[PDB]
Curated annotation (Swiss-Prot):
<comment type="subunit">
    <text>Interacts with ESR1 and NCOA3 and these interactions are enhanced by estradiol. Interacts with acetylated lysine residues on histone H1.4, H2A, H2B and H3 (in vitro).</text>
</comment>
<protein>
    <recommendedName>
        <fullName>ATPase family AAA domain-containing protein 2</fullName>
    </recommendedName>
</protein>
<comment type="function">
    <text>May be a transcriptional coactivator of the nuclear receptor ESR1 required to induce the expression of a subset of estradiol target genes, such as CCND1, MYC and E2F1. May play a role in the recruitment or occupancy of CREBBP at some ESR1 target gene promoters. May be required for histone hyperacetylation. Involved in the estrogen-induced cell proliferation and cell cycle progression of breast cancer cells.</text>
</comment>
<feature type="domain" description="Bromo">
    <location>
        <begin position="3"/>
        <end position="114"/>
    </location>
</feature>
<comment type="similarity">
    <text>Belongs to the AAA ATPase family.</text>
</comment>
<feature type="coiled-coil region">
    <location>
        <begin position="108"/>
        <end position="130"/>
    </location>
</feature>
């Protein structure tokens, strides 16, 4: 219905606003673009599904997310990719892991304060009807 297409348009406006607020935070610059395959050639042999905040906006505009749950699966993949590629005790690996955990925790905290639980349940019920 038109009403259902209006629901998904509100979901996309909400997701673009959360993603912009993450992308302007200086702590998260290392997640604003794909890991460069010329600078890091072993990256795409270790990490089987690369993800970053530029790719997330492209996916919102392609209508890939029909719930906040499917958006948070991609924020969780950015975080898990950084923990698995950079696992060592040295400071550069510890700094990127701390930033990855802060990106995940920040996204979940904005959604807990600003997403209405009944708006998410409406998106889930339209998705399950298709
Ligand atoms: C999310 O970003 C990462 O997982 N990274 C892996 C790399 C390791 C380290 O930071 C890079 C880029 C780079 N070039 C030279 N060393 C590095 C970004």
């Amino acid at each position: 219905s038109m009403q259902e297409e209006d629901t998904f348009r509100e979901l996309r406006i909400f997701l673009r606003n959360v993603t912009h607020r993450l992308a302007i935070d200086k702590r998260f610059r290392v997640f604003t673009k794909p890991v460069d395959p010329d600078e890091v050639p072993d990256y795409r042999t270790v990490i089987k599904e690369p993800m970053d905040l530029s790719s997330v906006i492209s996916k919102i505009d392609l209508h890939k997310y029909l719930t906040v749950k499917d958006y948070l699966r991609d924020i969780d993949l950015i975080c898990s990719n950084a923990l698995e590629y950079n696992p060592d005790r040295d400071p550069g690996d510890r700094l990127i892991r701390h930033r990855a955990c802060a990106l995940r925790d920040t996204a979940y905290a904005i959604i807990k304060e600003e997403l209405d639980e009944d708006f998410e349940q409406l998106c889930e019920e339209i998705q399950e009807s298709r």
